[PDB]
């Protein structure tokens, strides 16, 4: 992708995550499970909502009619009517197809950036208390219970709390 | 090793495909269609009022009183006029209907 | 054929729904109708790339 997160170091997605678009998977002594990140998912949904609304809101319904047919004398104007309808038809078809193709790639890249920032927020939070094992995973060098797991997700994580606990395991190897 | 935490995205059973500028037939978890490609295949009543049908006899015969245009829809209201392409009965006596195009929209 | 159905947009080929902003059934319409375009597929991506297990 453009940001290298989706189909990048994270090769595949989670089918078990059915509560949000982006989230975490934890594995501690108490148990394991999926949990979506609320901040990233809700903002993304509103952003894509605004993107879709930005396209279709102005495209309002029009009153149409067959109109008067053209007699033999009304040939030149009939050709002009064909010219304008075809001209608008060609322009609208080209613009609609082009906009969808361009915006779809931007939409895909939007998810790529949202996933990447989530990984960086965790990566910057943990710092040396975890190991980057790849595929978006973080092997903790210390003991992380459920409270510790949620602290990273809520953004209220404390590096000094497990600094010495991890450091002993870092210097172990 | 020990405890682990991961970051990933959502996947489902969607088969929807989209076309991007750089890629074609890209599977997406969710999508929205902006193009209606279905038609019911029947001519319905517009705004509740049923249209006016004429059959093989066209508007010119219907308003003039062509003898083939004798037994047909005799209604007081109609949303629009339906003419079959095979409409041949009409101005049986040769001639030109002056401002025929204008009258067709007036009786629409 | 002229059946006893109800519609808000009528085309020579048949009546269509006005639930979507675009149509491709026929360029000739009567009533409140979407914009006719010669496109065969206009689908806007909203979700991520659907990547199952592998």
């Amino acid at each position, epitope marked *: 992708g453009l940001f290298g997160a989706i189909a990048g170091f994270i090769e595949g997605g989670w089918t078990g995550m059915v509560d949000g678009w982006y989230g975490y998977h934890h594995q501690n002594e108490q148990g394991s499970g999926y949990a979506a990140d609320l901040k990233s998912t809700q903002n993304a*949904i509103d952003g894509i*909502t*605004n993107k879709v609304n930005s396209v279709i809101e102005k495209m*309002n*319904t029009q009153f149409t009619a067959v109109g008067k047919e053209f007699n033999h004398l009304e040939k030149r104007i009939e050709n002009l009517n064909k010219k304008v309808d075809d001209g608008f038809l060609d322009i609208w078809t080209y613009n609609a197809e082009l906009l969808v193709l361009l915006e779809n790639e931007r939409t895909l890249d939007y998810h790529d950036s949202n996933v990447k920032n989530l990984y960086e927020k965790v990566r910057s939070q943990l710092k040396n208390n975890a190991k980057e094992i790849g595929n978006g995973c973080f092997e903790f060098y210390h003991k992380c219970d459920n409270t510790c797991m949620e602290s990273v997700k809520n953004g209220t994580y404390d590096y000094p709390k497990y600094s010495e606990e991890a450091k002993l395991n870092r210097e172990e190897i | 090793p020990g405890d682990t935490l991961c970051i990933g995205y959502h996947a489902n059973n969607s088969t929807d495909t989209v076309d991007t500028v750089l890629e074609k037939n890209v599977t997406v978890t*969710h999508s929205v269609n902006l193009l209606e490609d279905k038609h019911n295949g029947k001519l319905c009543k517009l705004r509740g009022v049923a249209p006016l049908h004429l059959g093989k006899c066209n508007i010119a015969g219907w308003i003039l009183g062509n003898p083939e245009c004798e037994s047909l829809s005799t209604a007081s209201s109609w949303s629009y006029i339906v003419e079959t392409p095979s409409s041949d009965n009409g101005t049986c006596y040769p001639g030109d209907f002056i401002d025929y195009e204008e009258l067709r929209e007036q009786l629409s | 054929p002229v059946h006893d159905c109800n519609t808000t947009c009528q085309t020579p080929k048949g009546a269509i729904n006005t639930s979507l902003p675009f149509q491709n059934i026929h360029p000739i319409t009567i009533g409140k109708c979407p914009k006719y375009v010669k496109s065969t597929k206009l689908r806007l991506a909203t979700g991520l790339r659907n990547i199952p297990s592998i």
Partner: antibody, heavy 124, light 109 residues
């Protein structure tokens, strides 16, 4: 601008039946804003039932309404329908529909624009 | 799990021009994902505050929401005759959009 949500009229239904309530918008056609349904028993508080997200194309319901509620939308027109089956006298309330939007654009958590309300009465 | 929106108080009596402070507490910490509403008898509710601090366009500046995390508030600097109604608090955190129990404002005599 000054969008108003117009719901269906008040309906009196027998117990154990199913009622469908429409929620149509005005002004800009072809909108994709998220919508929600909320009921209020006479003299009681507000109760959230469910909501629809046209972007995802799916709907989510509360636990008590899982299996009885069916929230549908008519494409992108902005009209959203609500279906409740197996009606009881305890469901007699005023039902509202709300658009989830602020002046900051789409807002999934809020209910900026509300409907006119639809009273539903249930007895034999 | 689910969230529980409890307001305090449940009913208050105040005169025109009296400061009114209605609080709303939560089952769990929700940060700033809270909204405030106002309902008049026989009418639909109207939004006043979203994100617990952002005033809705059209709401007078006399309404000032506040709070962050577990405890929130809704402050009316100058209570006007048109502000005599019931007020609710709602969250955006989790899928069940749990409402508050309501708070009715009565005129003083």
């Amino acid at each position: 601008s000054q969008v108003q949500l117009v719901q269906s009229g008040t309906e009196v239904k027998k117990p154990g039946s199913s009622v469908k309530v429409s929620c149509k918008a005005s002004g800009v056609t072809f909108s994709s804003y998220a919508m929600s349904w909320v009921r209020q028993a006479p003299g009681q508080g507000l109760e959230w039932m469910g909501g629809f997200i046209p972007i995802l194309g799916t709907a989510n319901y509360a636990q008590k309404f899982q299996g009885r509620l069916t929230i549908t939308a008519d494409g992108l027109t902005g009209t959203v329908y609500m279906e409740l089956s197996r009606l009881r006298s305890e469901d007699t309330a005023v039902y509202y529909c709300a658009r989830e939007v602020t002046w900051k654009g789409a807002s999934i958590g809020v209910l900026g624009i509300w409907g006119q309300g639809t009273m539903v009465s249930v007895s034999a | 799990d689910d969230i529980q929106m409890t307001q305090s108080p449940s009913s208050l009596s105040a005169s025109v021009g009296d400061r009114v402070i209605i609080t709303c507490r939560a089952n769990q910490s929700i940060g700033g994902y809270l909204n405030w509403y106002q309902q008049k008898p026989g009418k639909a509710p109207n939004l006043l505050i979203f994100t617990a601090s952002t005033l809705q366009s059209g709401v007078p500046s006399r309404f000032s929401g506040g709070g962050s995390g577990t405890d929130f508030t809704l402050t009316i600097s100058s209570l006007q005759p048109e502000d005599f109604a019931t007020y609710y608090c709602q969250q955006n955190y989790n899928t069940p959009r749990t409402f508050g129990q309501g708070t009715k404002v009565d005129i003083k005599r």
